[PDB]
From a paper:
In [name], the [name] ([name]), RicF (YlbF), and RicT (YaaT) proteins accelerate the phosphorylation of the transcription factor Spo0A, contributing to genetic competence, sporulation, and biofilm formation, and are also essential for the correct maturation of several protein-encoding and riboswitch RNAs. These proteins form a stable complex (RicAFT) that carries two [4Fe-4S]+2 clusters. We show here that the complex is a 1:1:1 heterotrimer, and we present the X-ray crystal structures of a RicAF heterotetramer and of a [name] dimer.
Numbering used by the authors:
A (entry chain A), B (entry chain A): 1 to 122
Write the structure that this text describes.
């Protein structure tokens, strides 16, 4: 008889989220994230970036656009460097596993809902 | 002890999908879709569009690009007309309710997974 309400759907979505939080994928992400916070080269580059971001806000505000563009290029060069660090590559692989899982859930749900609608139209 | 596997997550995602299929939102979509298939003006416009789409493939293949562009404009004019029909507006409102529900589920899951990761980093 009774149709599920949106509160019922959302409550079960929070149950699914808690199960996703207890996966090897989210486990690997948590472990990969803890390693980046213990890497000296990561520390150095993030701190250079943060100092530059500080100069960038100043330069934007005084309309020193040429100097701003040099600062933004240097931020882009440091961001590129960060991505080459193997603890950062491992963290990116772990982020991709979590995002791939959420995407598989959404697609699974979307496809099955669409399927059940199509079969109902007869 | 044991972490959920991706099969476990996906099986529960299919359980969530079946609950979404038994909502007032999906109920309204199914009822709104059945009405469009019983509307004479919808029938007439969809059949004009389909005939034009047939001419369009021909004209594209012979590289009659000027005539193709007239045919594509007429398809666009008929598509606009379809959207003004109140059974089509009702169907669009119902499609938006279903899509809004799936989006609320994905965001609910995404936010809660992110939240639980942030709280774990301490
Ligand atoms: Cl399917
Ligand atoms: Cl939150």
């Amino acid at each position: 008889m009774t149709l599920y309400s949106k509160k019922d759907i959302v409550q079960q979505a929070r149950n699914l989220a808690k199960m996703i939080s207890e996966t090897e994928e989210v486990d690997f992400f948590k472990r990969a994230e803890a390693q980046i916070n213990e890497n000296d080269k990561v520390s150095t580059i993030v701190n250079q970036i943060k100092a530059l971001q500080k100069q960038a806000v100043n330069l934007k505000h005084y309309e020193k656009h040429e100097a701003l563009k040099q600062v933004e290029a240097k931020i882009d060069a440091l961001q590129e460097e960060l991505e080459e660090i193997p603890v950062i590559q491992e963290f990116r692989d772990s982020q991709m596993e979590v995002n791939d899982l959420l995407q598989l859930v959404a697609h699974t749900i979307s496809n099955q809902v669409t399927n059940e609608i199509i079969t109902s139209t007869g």
